[PDB]
């Protein structure tokens, strides 16, 4: 969204005698966005001069032009959030000083004022500065830890609750969304590996967890290779137990996708690749060896069984109650989570416990595509079909959660994008089918549960505590243009 407000100034002072034209112009300026660099002191001084009338909104911008301008300005287009924001800030400082020379008072409602707007905006600019500095310092530039992550997300939530009243401004909303996208993308991969290890794990379970960790997080964790190399030689009598002959390796279903993760452990170095497309011995994906050689809770880390269960090519004689009880437990645990909006710390905790389950966004998408690839009609028992539909439930709600988390923000823009995201995910996830009705209801409940942004009517009343009958109009119009819903009616 771009609008050249200089030509808008031309229109404003060309037809200054008409209030309707100025109202229309300021309306498309509000729905539009303006570059910060294009804004100087002379620019919006001429904006004020071009509309010297003060009818209702012209007067409103006479008192609070700064807040109105920052409610629609854009900064992200020029690749300079902090720099353009601070340039805008000092030119607005010049504006505030000019108005103070004209006259200064805390008129209307003290919650919002040009001086108050400048103070809040400079506080936000500072918080942006610490966000960038902590990102730079704790990422080691351009490429325990858990208490540090907890503390830093604590200062981020403190800055959020400081900036919580300021969410209905486009510039503030986009800055906050960018910061939160950066922080979430950083935290989703920077999770530690303490919880993977347990006594009941076998060699295969731990090595598979380590492959998932390597393919999920390798930025600054460089000690993995040596540990894996040592563990290969420590377990010399173990990998041969659950491996099949190379002659009948690739022919069995499900092992084709497992070959990528398998060759990493066979070669003896995660840095190696199967570029030649050679043939190597294949771990037996059959559950007869799986149950005897690994714990059922770590099955999602193992792509072969996911692919085979989704494909329904597993023999009915093969036992599958292990993953049945494991998946029932995890589904019940994750469904019982409260509908209340989890805090940012709570959101990070729930994300990291999801990552502990091995649900990687790329992995989830790449192994959920086959679910629609698999034929709808197949011969199967009751419990395997129940497992397949529960797999659809869990995998698809995880995929929707992750693809909405990457754009998650407690701002109106997140809902504005997420409505279309939900429509697209309905069109792709379900298509024209119907048997996905209940899973779709559960997915909608989850996405409206964990990612619910809430605006209080009392919050708007505080927003308009001192606002008279005039300022309600355009504030409500901006809220409707941003959120897209007639979310209240003002009847005092």
């Amino acid at each position: 969204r771009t609008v050249d407000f200089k030509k808008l100034i031309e229109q404003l002072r060309a037809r200054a005698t008409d209030k309707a034209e100025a109202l229309n112009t300021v309306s498309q300026l509000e729905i539009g966005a303006v570059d910060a660099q294009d804004v100087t002191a002379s620019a919006v001084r001429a904006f004020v001069g071009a509309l010297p009338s003060s009818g209702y909104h012209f007067g409103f911008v006479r008192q609070n032009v700064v807040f109105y301008l920052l409610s629609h300005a854009t900064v992200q287009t020029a690749r300079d959030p902090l720099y353009a924001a601070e340039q805008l800030h000092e030119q607005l400082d010049r504006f505030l000083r000019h108005q103070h020379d004209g006259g200064g008072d805390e008129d209307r409602l003290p919650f919002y004022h040009n001086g108050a707007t400048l103070t809040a905006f400079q506080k936000l600019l500072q918080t942006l500065r610490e966000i960038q500095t902590v990102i730079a310092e704790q990422s080691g530039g351009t490429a325990g830890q858990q208490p540090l992550v907890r503390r830093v997300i604590t200062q981020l939530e403190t800055a959020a609750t400081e900036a919580r009243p300021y969410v209905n401004c486009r510039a503030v909303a986009e800055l906050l969304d960018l910061t939160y996208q950066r922080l979430i993308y950083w935290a989703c991969t920077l999770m530690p590996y303490v919880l993977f290890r347990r006594d009941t794990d076998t060699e295969l379970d731990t090595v598979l967890l380590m492959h998932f960790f390597y393919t999920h997080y390798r930025s600054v964790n460089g000690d993995l290779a040596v540990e894996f190399q040592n563990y290969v030689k420590n377990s010399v009598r173990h990998m041969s137990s659950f491996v099949s002959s190379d002659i009948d390796g690739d022919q069995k279903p499900g092992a084709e996708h497992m070959r990528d993760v398998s060759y990493k452990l066979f070669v003896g170095n995660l840095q190696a690749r199967d570029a030649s497309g050679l043939m190597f011995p294949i771990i037996s994906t059959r559950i007869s060896t799986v149950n005897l050689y690994l714990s059922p809770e770590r099955m999602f880390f193992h792509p072969g069984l996911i692919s085979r269960l989704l494909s329904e090519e597993v023999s009915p004689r093969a036992n599958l109650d292990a993953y049945a009880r494991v998946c029932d437990r995890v589904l019940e645990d994750h469904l019982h989570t409260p509908r209340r909006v989890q805090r940012l710390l709570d959101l990070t905790q729930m994300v990291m416990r999801l990552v502990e389950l091995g649900f990687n966004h790329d992995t989830c998408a790449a192994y959920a595509q086959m679910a629609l690839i698999q034929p709808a009609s197949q011969k199967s028992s009751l419990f395997v079909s129940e497992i397949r539909e529960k797999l659809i439930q869990i995998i698809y709600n995880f995929y929707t959660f992750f693809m909405c988390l990457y754009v998650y923000s407690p701002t109106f823009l997140f809902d504005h994008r997420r409505r279309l995201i939900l429509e697209q995910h309905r069109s792709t996830l379900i298509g024209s089918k119907e048997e996905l009705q209940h899973v779709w209801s559960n997915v909608t409940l989850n996405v409206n549960t964990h990612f619910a942004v809430q605006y209080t009517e009392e919050d708007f009343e505080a927003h308009t505590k001192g606002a008279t009958e005039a300022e309600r109009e355009y504030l409500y119009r901006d809220l409707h243009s941003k959120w897209g819903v007639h979310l209240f009616t003002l009847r005092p």
Binding site: N24, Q28, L420
Partner: peptide, 19 residues
């Protein structure tokens, strides 16, 4: 209040194109 509806419909059309 008509041209704003024009612009919203155009933005929805662009979003459909992106989808």
């Amino acid at each position: 209040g008509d041209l704003e509806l024009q612009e919203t419909l155009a933005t929805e059309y662009f979003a459909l194109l992106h989808g």
